[PDB]
Ligand binder design. Structure first.
Ligand SMILES: Nc1ncnc2c1ncn2[C@H]1C[C@H](O)[C@@H](COP(=O)(O)OP(=O)(O)OP(=O)(O)O)O1
Ligand SMILES: Nc1ncnc2c1ncn2[C@H]1C[C@H](O)[C@@H](COP(=O)(O)OP(=O)(O)OP(=O)(O)O)O1
Ligand SMILES: [Mg+2]
Ligand SMILES: [Mg+2]
Ligand SMILES: [Zn+2]
Ligand SMILES: [Zn+2]
Lengths: 348, 356
DNA sequence: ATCTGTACATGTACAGAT
DNA sequence: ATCTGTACATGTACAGAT
DNA sequence: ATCTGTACATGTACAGAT
DNA sequence: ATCTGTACATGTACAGAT
């Protein structure tokens, strides 16, 4: 009854979805046109929508949209940066860019920013660039505030990089056929736009599997009929929404939680879904246990400082390198706290 | 245990699989290549392997292969033949290498199949590598059948097909009722795939005899047989084994053995058993109603279901609901009651026909 | 010199074999 | 329980053509 | 090569029935 | 309270035409 009532609150309204979509769609379609019918280095860029709005796990409002502009590049040689798993250098139109991530992002951003100056019917500007974000972010204003991330991506049609050989461990959940077919899809690369000063900073790209993640979110049962009109509904997505909301609310309240992001929750629940594959373990009537064993799984990840990338097993999103220890026990007490008092933060 | 051992007899041997595939593939590759040559009307034809050997339900010996030579035919218009659901006239809206088979707008099936057949015959003459002849044409069959004598005997049905990429013909709207078993996304995807038309090729002196085509969904049946569980891991190396294909194999064998002894059964064919089990799989969607430890019971309910279809004279095509393969129009009641008796007799007496 | 239908190259599920 | 031939889907190369 | 048209998935919203 | 059935809305895949 409690968690159900929070999910009613988190539910997007049909009207809000329509108003945001037609304005987001107007901007994106025009932006896509410039990079094409104009003689840019990005002629051939194709649009692939990603993230929580398109996975139907957006909460609260339709105010954040993520779009990948992906560009096929033939026979690129990858070269893994210092064994990290997820970061690579790229080698062999694009001549003006070893292919520089920053050099290519800047021209892309230049093109976007120019075309936004020519938009006269929508209140839209280009947010100032952020370190560590490969996106060019639009800030739109219907009366309400909407944010669009335009992510630049390379598309390689080759065998996936060796670092993912043990990745995507869906074999007992979605199976070997699904896994083999998914690994036949392209894979993508996006700028590592960190501004730390470390060595190969400006030429490093990151592996992206947002297209695989979207398929999983929408094909998430061991039974083919899970959540379909002739199957049984499960509560896998509601748990992800609840865990996203609890992290959102904690991040509003505490600046110490700044190094956490919803992707950490997304990754943790891919692992849960793999360890509890049966749809009956995500039955709607057990929403509380499910949310709770998700909380405990997430605290075990904090306590051991271990949360491996679902596709890149050796890449630990929870290493000392990315999140100082103390940041983690801060989140652990805060989370054990909400847990052991019936989630007060959910009433605000 | 009794049925486990039948399956052991029925299992194909890798050695045989090997010697038979090496030959069969040689011939088919050579026939396909000749269809791309010169000013061939069939240039562009593409190969699709179908049937029980590629579904992995071929029993006893790998001695019968089925292959589809399908030709994409755009800008195509269908006239259902007399409300039968399965049979169609094919018309074109433009005036094409197929023109030599047109009869003002209407695409002649027997003319096309005849030209196809003459080419296979001519290319088989040039094969001096293996003992292989073209079997005398069989009425009702769209196939061109090769008999290969690699010591052992081997049949290959080369089926000629039109490939259309449009949405499926409305007589299938209510077909393929897999929503509760493989689900709606699977169904939507399957129905985006092409559909196929093969020559009906009967010689019954009925109107439009030589211009009637028949819907075929062999490619969809291939997908279903190799993706047959409600659970995605069914029969996979990290999932649980089921006995769905093992029931099919036992049913096919019972029919095969009886058909081998009793001429009364000429009207029957493995497609009848294959259809019945598609319905049984829809009736019982859960993989747990096909546990391997339940083989004798699973096989038994499939037999009961088949007897009911026989007795009530109703076995609806899985894809075309209004097309009844057990109508009086296609099989005498005496044919059906005869098979009913033999099935009931096998069932209530230890399946003595398995030991033959 | 560049283009492209044909076919080799690669990876793996399925299932027989040891 | 692992090793292994066939089938099949998709990436890529290049002799022969433009 | 680009774009429209079609089909049905995923949602939200709400009355009527359990 | 929840389940079921209809209406309403967007997202996405791809056939066919221009
Ligand atoms: N593949 C990734 N690797 C690292 N960080 C990521 C990745 N994907 C997303 N993030 C981070 C970026 C942002 O800080 C945060 C949310 O970004 P976003 O792309 O909008 O995700 P999302 O759409 O799945 O969830 P949300 O509901 O928060 O919008 O997650
Ligand atoms: N769609 C169909 N409609 C009518 N009869 C069919 C159909 N498909 C096959 N048949 C008939 C043709 C043969 O007489 C019999 C088996 O044909 P075939 O294509 O070899 O089937 P199969 O490969 O699935 O089974 P088998 O193991 O007996 O070869 O069924
Ligand atoms: Mg989002
Ligand atoms: Mg066969
Ligand atoms: Zn579900
Ligand atoms: Zn199975």
């Amino acid at each position: 009854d409690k968690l159900k009532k929070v999910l009613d609150k988190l539910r997007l309204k049909r009207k809000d979805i329509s108003e945001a979509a037609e304005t987001v769609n107007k901007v994106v379609e025009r932006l896509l046109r410039r990079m094409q019918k104009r003689e840019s280095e990005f002629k051939g860029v194709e649009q692939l929508n990603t993230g929580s709005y398109y996975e139907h796990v957006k909460i609260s409002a339709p105010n954040e949209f993520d779009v990948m502009f992906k560009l096929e590049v033939p026979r690129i040689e990858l070269q893994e940066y210092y064994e990290t798993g997820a970061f690579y250098l790229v080698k062999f139109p694009l001549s003006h860019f070893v292919l520089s991530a920053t050099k290519m992002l800047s021209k892309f951003r230049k093109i976007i920013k120019e075309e936004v100056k020519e938009i006269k019917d929508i209140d839209v500007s280009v947010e100032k660039e952020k370190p560590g974000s490969p996106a060019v972010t639009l800030l739109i204003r219907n009366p309400e505030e909407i944010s669009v991330d335009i992510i630049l991506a390379l598309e390689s049609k080759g065998s996936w990089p060796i670092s993912t050989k043990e990745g995507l461990p869906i074999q007992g959940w979605l199976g070997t056929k699904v896994r083999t077919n998914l690994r036949r899809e392209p894979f993508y690369l996006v700028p590592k736009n960190a501004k730390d000063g470390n060595s190969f900073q400006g030429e490093t790209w990151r592996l992206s599997f947002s297209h695989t993640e979207k398929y999983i979110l929408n094909n998430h049962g061991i039974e083919k009929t899970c959540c379909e009109s002739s199957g049984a509904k499960c509560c896998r997505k509601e748990c992800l929404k609840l865990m996203k909301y609890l992290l959102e609310q904690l991040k509003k309240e505490f600046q110490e939680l700044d190094a956490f992001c919803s992707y950490h929750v997304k990754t943790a629940i891919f692992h849960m879904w793999t360890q509890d594959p049966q749809d009956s373990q995500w039955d709607p009537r057990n929403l509380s246990s499910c949310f709770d064993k998700l909380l405990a799984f997430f605290l075990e990840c904090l306590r051991t400082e271990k949360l491996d990338h679902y596709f890149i097993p050796k890449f630990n999103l929870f290493s000392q390198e990315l999140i100082d220890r103390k940041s983690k026990e801060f989140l652990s007490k805060k989370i054990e706290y909400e847990r052991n008092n019936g989630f007060p933060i959910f009433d605000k």
